[PDB]
Amino acid sequence: LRPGDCEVCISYLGRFYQDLKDRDVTFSPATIENELIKFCREARGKENRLCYYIGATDDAATKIINEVSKPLAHHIPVEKICEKLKKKDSQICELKYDKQIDLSTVDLKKLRVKELKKILDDWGETCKGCAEKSDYI
């Protein structure tokens, strides 16, 4: 119910929900399940970890997938689904997306400059204040 809670849970299942309508899926538990598993093969990062925690992965976890497919079959808001999921598994709502800068900003966090130059995939070999590399790439 709070803001920025189950961030990945709400985003990912919301797009799952939408995609069901768009392809006009028969909204039924078993159907939704099969569609969730097939939807989860796309998943990387924390989204994949969500798919593991909601039991939507190959080598089935548990029946926690029912906590998703059942309420979804009866048009319960995707926030409500992620809210109840918090009780069963703590870690589900622990997932939050990783931020990307513009940057359009001055001298940022001393250790954050490294990931900025790691995302662009380049070595800042043996630096100690290597803004020179990032403002030159």
What descriptive keywords fit this protein?
NK-Lysin, mainly alpha, 137 residues, Transcription Termination Factor Rho, Rna-binding Domain, Chain A, Domain 1, 0% strand
Structural description of this entry:
One of its GO terms (cellular component) is extracellular region. The protein folds into 2 domains: 1-96, NK-Lysin, CATH 1.10.225; 97-137, SAP domain (Transcription Termination Factor Rho, Rna-binding Domain, Chain A, Domain 1, Orthogonal Bundle), CATH 1.10.720. The termini are far apart. It is built from 7 helices and no strands. The chain has helices at residues 7-22, 29-40, 45-53, 66-73, 78-88, 112-119, 131-134.
What is shown here, in short?
This protein has helices at residues 7-22, 29-40, 45-53, 66-73, 78-88, 112-119, 131-134. With 137 residues, the chain is an all-alpha fold.
